Amino acid sequence: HMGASRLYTLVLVLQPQRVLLGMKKRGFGAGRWNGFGGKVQEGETIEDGARRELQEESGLTVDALHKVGQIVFEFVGEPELMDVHVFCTDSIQGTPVESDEMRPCWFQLDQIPFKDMWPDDSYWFPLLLQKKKFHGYFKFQGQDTILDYTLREVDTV
Ligand SMILES: COc1nc(N)nc2c1ncn2[C@H]1C[C@H](O)[C@@H](COP(=O)(O)O)O1
């Protein structure tokens, strides 16, 4: 996937029988449940950015984040690809609380609200839930339509 890309993070708190999602309240993807995350800033590592965004959006801190995936997004007409680094943790510190950006809620693993999530999630979530590492690519036309996609399992994220 050639071209300048912009680094983002996505963090899924995934425990044995539940997963934490945030309802995005403003900005990009508002009105959909997602993992926690954002742009990676100058002067922080990708993992530092993931932690930062988890704290900003949910108040939670974490001992260890694990790399579980990479998803590259093309938005038709937008020059930069989005290079999203996906992370998982089971253990968390604190109780999740609402932020300006996100309203947190736990979901049982058989009640994941896919119809109110970004449409790409239904493709790669099953791999996340199976503990399989993956590389994904999705080309979107606007916010609702996937024109192209690829998805595979990887041994190294
Ligand atoms: C298009 O399909 C997509 N599907 C999913 N599941 N997540 C996506 C996504 N596009 C972007 N993100 C994620 C990355 C970031 O966590 C956040 C954006 O950063 P903020 O604008 O909220 O600061 O949204």
Numbering used by the authors: 0 to 156
From the paper:
MutT homologue 1 (MTH1) belongs to the NUDIX protein family and is known to be responsible for removal of oxidized purine nucleoside triphosphates from the nucleotide pool. O6-methyl-dGTP activity is exclusive to MTH1 among human NUDIX proteins and conserved through evolution but not found in bacterial MutT. We present a high resolution crystal structure of human and zebrafish MTH1 in complex with O6-methyl-dGMP.
In order to study the binding mode of O6-methyl-dGTP and explain the high activity of MTH1 with O6-methyl-dGTP co-crystals of both human and zebrafish MTH1 with O6-methyl-dGTP were produced. Within 6 Å of the methylated position, there are a large number of hydrophobic residues, namely F27, F72, F74, M81, W117, P118 (human) or A118 (zebrafish) and F139. When comparing the structure of human MTH1 with O6-methyl-dGMP bound with the previously solved structure of human MTH1 with 8-oxo-dGMP bound, there is a 1.1 Å shift in the position of the guanine base, which brings the methylated part of the guanine closer to the hydrophobic pocket. We sought to provide an explanation to the high activity of MTH1 with O6-methyl-dGTP by analysing the structures of both human and zebrafish MTH1 in complex with O6-methyl-dGMP. O6-methyl-dGMP was found to be clearly bound to both human and zebrafish MTH1 as seen from the electron density in Figure 5A and B. Given the shift of 1.1 Å in position of the base of O6-methyl-guanine compared to when 8-oxo-dGMP is bound to MTH1, it is likely that the methylation of O6 is strengthening the binding of the base to the hydrophobic pocket. The structures are highly similar as shown by RMSD values, and the main difference is the position of the methylated base. The structural analysis reveals differences in the hydrogen bonding network when human MTH1 binds 8-oxo-dGMP and O6-methyl-dGMP as shown in Figure 5C.
